[model samples]
Target: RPTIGQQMETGDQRFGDLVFRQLAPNVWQHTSYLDMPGFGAVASNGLIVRDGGRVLVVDTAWTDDQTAQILNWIKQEINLPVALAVVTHAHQDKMGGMDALHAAGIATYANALSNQLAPQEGMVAAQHSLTFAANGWVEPATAPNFGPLKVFYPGPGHTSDNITVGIDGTDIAFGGCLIKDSKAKSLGNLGDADTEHYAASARAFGAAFPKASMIVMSHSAPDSRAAITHTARMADKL
Candidate 1:
């Protein structure tokens, strides 16, 4: 991964409307943009986790078309069999491409709450179910195929079903929309958020992934653990 102002961009690939950038060894961040009816272009991020000849997608793009492009790119470039996929929340950015993934026959996992909430938000739900512990953390080692990434649910912040993914064998975690990037000055979307619990969410999130120093959000660039601190401070206002 290139440092800030390193004069080099992450290895990028544009497949139709989807854009992919390799962020670290065995981890790639992919993006797709949606032009909301009156909101202009909005971009969302997802992850491509690879292990040797197999892969696991963390989240899907904003639409089925964009997600199909992602599958095509993976098949053509990496030429690896996708073992499974995980949706970190119920938002469109997280599980909006369920149709595409299901069509391709890849198993998809999401929080049980996410599956229950997606259709209510006009999005498709993941097929498989994952549950969080009593304290808002998902069972560790839920995904043994993709380096056994750990999942965490830090109460409710960006959305009630939002969660984070900590990838083993690497110092990186996928924060979905729960963890904001350094560039963000405000929480982008809160229609599904629990404002009263946002502060506790950030604190629980920071403590959930002790091994990951670089946390990847659903937008902007991946940031250091301080981004979690930054979000805690931001949440203090709500």
Candidate 2:
């Protein structure tokens, strides 16, 4: 992995309508623009980390086509097998491409709570079933590693099932929707959020990854420690 201050923009690959930005030596972010109910067009993001001779994808694109493009990008450019995928939550922006992933024979994992509640929000139950049937349900644990990625649940904030992923040897922490960008004045979406406990949850998130130099969330651009503090302060007022 590159050093904390090193320039890690080795290169970027444009596949279909999505752009994969290289943030570190083996870390890339694929962002897709989608229409949110009130927010209109927003960038939905996912992380890809290369480990050993294979790769682990965190979350998926907003559509099957986009996900397929990412898979192709990996196979053709990186020439590595996509060994596993972890969905951070039940939202479409996170698990929307799961069906496409399963179709391409990629194993997808999700927390049990997410798998159970995702379908209630109009996500495909069959997709959830596919993940479960394919042994993608993750049991609750302190923090577990899948390849070079460490998955942790920092209590409920943005959503009850939200989780964060940290790259083993880097200062990168994928906070998912549990975090907010520094520019965010309000919690992005609170439909299923634990607004009452959001501040505490965000604080716990900061403690869990105190060394994080870059924090990636689904919607805004990635930020440093500012994003974590921004989320905490906003949640406190909410």
Candidate 3:
């Protein structure tokens, strides 16, 4: 039998790189959860887009052991100045550890309402709240401020306040919870979401950049243009 290292070498080395991969040169996918045995699976996914050496991390992922691992990867690799963090939605699975990132000098951003939901709801708003209540993970507060990262609300989808980050020049969008996996048969309505607005949002997103195709979803495969179209189709149908 091949050794563990040997077997790993045969597969994609990037997959073994502990939840971090460069999707498009400067653009990166940082996973806060892995498909491991026993513990099941619980964590959020994050995107790190590097522009002119400054990095913008959207959605801080969930809270768990994987959280530390993702953070460590940022420290070891790239080491670029983490300029901002754009938490696309208010779900805990996505922004649980946002406070940690904010404390480390990274400006945190979220939709104005998306930024307010959790705080208004208090720390109980975190998905980790269940984990903490179930296990022992400590619930952290929302960041006090997000330096240059302004949490701007751009309308609705998936939630009342879904934020999309524009990757300058590229026309790519770090569409947080607004978009999900193409395979998603139904939208997981957490709080306030309008089916009519979702379709409009999708169309608006498309119109925002007629040339833009690539989009990053929250709970499914990383990013894909086809996926965006599929979600838009579903939203329109709904």
Candidate 4:
């Protein structure tokens, strides 16, 4: 039997400034474009995980208005209640729609460090937070938790709160801005990154999710863990 995502038509969805492209079993990659200094137009990726009667979103669509648009898109398309949402980090592209999420009455979670840095970094903070344990990972092994997601912090490379999300029971993971895509020739935005630990952090991401057949990045296409090696090697030179 085909899963909902697989059963859904092959057509992708567009709403306002965002695009939702179904990528995995029950996952859809949501993206939005933003204009930066010299990058021209860049698209940032997130995820929408649809389970039984509810859905979970990875991050907002890069802005509060765009986030609201995605929520509207969900209500019309998926038609399921958004049970939870998690911001991968404190950057605007990750947590920009936080206010819209709260206004929608959705339960949102972010890393403790993300919560602490969000406001300081000019991004909205989440309503709740999940802290990585001493082992540096927060994953619910069984049901009645935060779904089948493993949130891991590899000692902060991209930012002090950079975390990667690995979906349990699947080989898909969200690498956010830390792990570059396959074609990336440079490690992105080092303004807030830990230069010395980036390579090691990227390595830990690969080891933590060795079976991550597809690791999604915030600003690029999905690729295999070999991209992690690409990212690590790129960071090694700097």
Candidate 5:
């Protein structure tokens, strides 16, 4: 498997500020920039996992326009139809492009808790517009399989509905905002973090997937052990 930044050497596609880099044989790290309120402008990363001709997207762009660009690229480049889109959290960075994805006739799945708590975090009327596939809402303590992606909610750290996904048959784990990047000196955002349960949540993630080869966080580069260890250390200090 390619290390974190090795894929950027070639086969990197860019659309405006969004960039998609192939990390594994069928995995592409989709990165997009968001203008945050207190943080100015920051970059967020998501995952696109392809199995055969079907694709599963982990998260969407910070805005719908950027997400549309991604959709178009996948159609023109990969030529595979998107089967499912999993939003790992309720935050805008993860769920912001939902409107665009839905407009493209794609079905989205999210944790049941995220569906209930997103409005509390102020993403407008919440994701009520999204469906749980009639029986799609993922219940707690369940490891639901969406193609090759295994959606796991170890417990809430970044938010009450934060989730981590592991690609089956691969060592890749998309930690969303729950796992900090290796370069992250501190927990990135605490505006909606569960400080009391943050450390425990991270510990759960580390215990659940002990052999994760490449761990991808929302910001910064990817790392395996550091993504779990660093976040645990920071949470302990808090």
Candidate 6:
């Protein structure tokens, strides 16, 4: 899997392959196939998790250009019906092109807080409106759309509102941005977390999804129980 910098560099400068790497059974990581030669011109990370005949998407890519690329990638790889598209968090970078995903006939899902903050994030998502004018992306409905698909927000972790998505079938949890790499020296350029609350939030997430076989974050591949256990141990120590 490409690091955040590697993915960003590809889109910002347009210098890599537009290839999709399979991270797991139905999960994939999409990145630039070649360089675009500019800064801040890139695709955001997303996931394609499958459940038999239907496929679910974790987050949509950044710009409309990237959005189109992602949709094509999905079609090429999994021709199954698009079941649901879950915007793991409210960050514009994560949920920006929800409208497009929705227009494509996939159900868009977000947490309660994400639903609450979506309007505010909508303004940010709207900026990409003109660029993706051709893509029919409207304001998405904010509700925990999953019936048995569990997603919870213990407290403010990454932001004041972030959700740890749990897939019942796979027993895989996608902790959007709450859990970070223990060895990561840098935060994601913006650190709005309340360390105290974030730690507490981490504990909550740990307890919330104890049965998870793997914990997946937005930026990297799925982590083993060991990773989350290590994060839990470290957070407790902190």
Candidate 1 per-residue lDDT over residues 1-238, each given as its tens digit: 2111112254667678777788787888888888777656677888898888799999998889889999998998789988889988887878889899999999989988888988788888888778878887766555444465777788889888888888878899888888786656887677778999998898898888876888888876678988788887888898
TM-score of each: 0.91, 0.85, 0.71, 0.90, 0.85, 0.70
RMSD, candidate 6, Å: 8.3
Candidate lDDT values, in order: 0.81, 0.76, 0.56, 0.81, 0.75, 0.57
Best by TM-score: 1
Question: Per-residue CA lDDT of candidate 5, range 1-238, in tens?
Answer: 1222222335667766678777788988888876656646677889988888788888888889988988987897689989778888888888888878888877777776777776775542223323222222234334334667766777768887787888878888888889887667778779888898888888777776778889887876678778798898888877
**Separate clash counts for every candidate:** 0, 0, 0, 0, 1, 16
Whole-model alpha-carbon lDDT for candidate 4: 0.81
- Candidate 6 lDDT tens digits, 1-238: 2425233333122312344556557566554322336543333455667677777777666544555667766676687877777666677657766767756766666654566667876612221111101121123233323433565665765677666667666667777667755454433433656656666777677777889877666554456666555555555544
Q: After superposition, how far is residue 42 of candidate 5 from its true place, in Å?
A: 0.6
Pairwise lDDT winner, candidates 2 and 4: 4
Clashing pairs in 2: none
Candidates 1 and 3, the one with greater TM-score: 1
Candidate that beats the other on lDDT, 1 or 5, i.e. the better one: 1
Q: How close to the true structure is residue 220 of candidate 3, measured as C-alpha lDDT? A: 55
Q: lDDT winner between 4 and 5, please give it.
A: 4
Which pairs of residues collide in candidate 5?
Answer: 132-136
Query: Candidate 3's error at 47, in angstroms?
Result: 0.9
lDDT of 3 at 116: 56
Q: How close is candidate 5 to the true structure, as a TM-score?
A: 0.85
Task: Please report how far candidate 1 places residue 109 from its true position, in Å.
Answer: 0.6
Question: How well is each residue in 99-139 modelled by candidate 2, as lDDT tens digits?
Answer: 78888887777766788887786554223322121222224
